[PDB]
Design a binder for this molecule. Structure first.
Ligand code: CPL
Ligand code: CPL
Ligand code: CLR
Ligand code: CLR
Lengths: 378, 378
């Protein structure tokens, strides 16, 4: 059981965050920088932390040995309450920064100082040299991130692949960071960054899928099993093909060279291909569903740890829907595409992708515990 | 150990209460009825509940068998966390009502209904017929209150005398209620109730002291022990003398009878008398300190359970100051001695009196557990 003081802190942070969110909404309805884009990354990170705490709680309840799957220390483990506490505290900081930006309480301090301080403090907390807060977990996360970003140089384990998938679900943060860099470089044609797109933008969008693709190639080289690793690599490269076709279509829309429609057709066909590939991989391989052996459970795996099959069915439906939504969101953010509705579409879709990745984490850990689908254990 | 969900709720309520207090302070700084009088009772009740939770925690930590002193059922005991939860929820409701009054969010709904309903809920929370929200403790409290108010009829146990003392420390609530009744009756001469003082106000001021005095007389009759019960009865009657002399002086000021200075001197004499009487009784009898037996602890009883004697000395000093403060508060509130600043002085003093009674409960329960100071046990 978690410490009583930890539960008290979790409750206090949740309450403060709720009241701050209510105040923010009231100020927005009643009462220079792209605040939405600046704060989208922080909001998505807080949501991801909260959903990860929920994932840990559900894994513990279901009996899934997520500690064994992630190779975490059996003696020392991070309770879901700790994740909830961190998410709540970061939510309070995010809401306070947003309120300060909206109100500008202190004139001398410019508005952007609040978001820069928020993000810098979050980074420092992650890389805090001292052992004040969750030092073991933070160091483990830093090592895992370093291994993941260096996908080919280090052998791939379950934790590395899982973190690479999480970063794939969090490409919106990288997109927002790149957009902010462009905004500072050029804004500070006014909206040149949003008006025009470049190859660097597509590369930033595709970096997580590139990391996953290189991880799959490394696993193929180590194990020499062509089928699964190469199929996953194709699944991840569908994203590159789609994004590059969208970029070409947008570029030739800006200047008509008689190839814009070809690029549009390529983008749409590869968008459908990527959506189908990712959805099939998630439903059949990551979750191990639709197997023939299952006789009692229809469209599900023979053994299901979670009590309800309705969970699995709703998960399949929310997986297909949000796979299509995430493909659309990546299309929207990578290129101009829809010029005015792109930002709103991406903002609405990113939390939905975070929720989809949360459900995917649930069911992937379930399948990994029941069967060695990832083949990361002897 | 309290349930984890209870701790989470306590934290949530504390955080929401803190943010609501911050919002109230901001609104007051940036921005028909005497809101202070209306809301002081609720604020004092919430503060008393929080301090009571702290008292329970301290009694449990120090080994004081407060359960046996209060004759509560050993199997079922209300933990400090539950009291904190109740106080936080009540404070949240109080702050919401005050904010609604300040902002008048609903034009159709009159302002004056916002406080009433709040207090109404509190009443319905206390008398809730359904077996919910600590129904057993609520029913025990209701029975204790009924017995205390009908003090002569029933024999005085430790719980009855303790609750009567708590009421003595919370007479400001009754005074505010009576003032509100007068304000509705007459104002709804400007400030007629505030400008003039009447006998009924003095009678209301003496209700808790009357209850304690009659309880002491009943105990004297039951046990036939003259010294303690009669000395305590005189201690409580000093308050009647002070209040009546202050009221007479105020009335004489209102209409010159040529005896105003005589009543001023009499009120001052009885005010010093009451302050000294109450302070001596609390320091020597209720707390049992300054015992001759003690040789290691100076000015303290031989056996001390609390870790620090500095706690005892600080409590002594705070009681010395706050007893005189409380007598001053009673004198001003019961009459029109300080019409310009009487309300502000009473508002500042009442929380201080509540804190003084909190410390007094601490040390009185400690002494009662150590020795049968109240002679409630054989
Ligand atoms: C694109 C922008 C950046 C994207 C975000 C990047 C990363 C965050 C995502 C996921 C974190 C990993 C979740 C754990 C999964 C394993 C299951 C489990 O719950 O295991 C936990 C591992 O705890 C963790 O890893 C920490 C959880 C996350 C805490 C968040 C820290 C602050 C982050 C601030 C923002 C950082 C970015 C800067 C802003 C731009 C068990 O803990 P333990 O103490 O047993 O650890 C083992 C330690 N031994 C082996 C030595 C005993
Ligand atoms: C204008 C008048 C204002 C109202 C009067 C003032 C204060 C009321 C509140 C508390 C006074 C009682 C404190 C007793 C503490 C003893 C030590 C202990 O903490 O032990 C507790 C005492 O439990 C209590 O009594 C409950 C404590 C208070 C909780 C809050 C109740 C709601 C109050 C709302 C007031 C609304 C008024 C509106 C305006 C009129 C043991 O708990 P148990 O669950 O074992 O209870 C015993 C149950 N058996 C005997 C069956 C096992
Ligand atoms: C609204 C629709 C489209 C979303 C899809 C259904 C959602 C609500 C389903 C999908 C997977 C489900 C989760 C699957 C597993 C668990 C673990 C269990 O111990 C508690 C419930 C919990 C946490 C479920 C809650 C409901 C859930 C999140
Ligand atoms: C006004 C100034 C001079 C003195 C103020 C002293 C106050 C703060 C002192 C008086 C009695 C003290 C309490 C006496 C006993 C306990 C029980 C212990 O387990 C925790 C601390 C606690 C709860 C103390 C906290 C501090 C306290 C409330």
């Amino acid at each position: 059981p978690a410490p009583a003081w930890t539960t008290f802190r979790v409750g206090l942070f949740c309450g403060i965050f709720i009241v701050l969110n209510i105040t923010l909404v009231l100020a927005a309805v009643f009462k220079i920088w792209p605040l939405i884009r600046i704060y989208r990354g922080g909001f998505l990170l807080i949501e991801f932390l909260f959903l990860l705490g929920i994932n840990t709680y559900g894994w513990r309840q279901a009996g899934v040995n997520h500690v064994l799957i992630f190779e975490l220390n059996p003696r020392s483990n991070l309770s879901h309450q700790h994740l909830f506490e961190i998410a709540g505290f970061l939510g309070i900081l995010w809401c306070l920064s947003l309120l300060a930006c909206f109100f500008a309480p202190i004139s001398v301090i410019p508005t952007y100082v609040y978001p820069l301080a928020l993000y810098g403090f979050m980074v420092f907390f992650l890389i805090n040299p001292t052992k004040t807060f969750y030092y073991k977990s933070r160091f483990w996360l830093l090592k895992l991130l370093f291994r993941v970003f260096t996908a080919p140089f280090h052998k791939v384990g379950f934790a590395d692949f899982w973190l690479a998938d999480q970063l794939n679900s969090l490409s919106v943060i990288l997109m927002d960071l790149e957009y902010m860099i462009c905004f500072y470089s050029l804004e500070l044609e006014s909206g040149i960054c949003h008006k025009y797109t470049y190859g660097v933008r597509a590369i930033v969008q595709c970096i997580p899928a590139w990391l996953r693709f290189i991880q799959c190639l490394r696993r193929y080289r180590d194990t020499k099993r062509a089928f699964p690793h190469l199929v996953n690599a194709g699944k991840y490269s569908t994203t590159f093909f789609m994004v590059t076709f969208a970029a070409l279509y947008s570029t030739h829309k800006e200047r008509g060279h008689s190839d814009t429609m070809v690029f549009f057709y390529l983008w749409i066909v590869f968008y459908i291909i990527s959506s189908c590939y990712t959805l099939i991989w998630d439903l059949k391989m990551d979750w191990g569903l639709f197997d023939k052996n299952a006789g009692e459970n229809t469209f599900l795996r023979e053994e299901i740890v979670y009590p309800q099959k309705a969970y699995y069915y709703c998960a399949i439906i929310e997986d297909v829907i949000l796979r299509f939504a995430w493909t659309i969101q990546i299309s929207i953010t990578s290129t101009t595409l829809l010029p005015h509705s792109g930002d709103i579409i991406a903002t609405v879709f990113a939390p939905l992708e975070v929720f989809r990745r949360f459900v995917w984490n649930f069911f992937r850990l379930e399948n990994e515990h029941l069967n060695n689908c990832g083949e990361f254990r002897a």
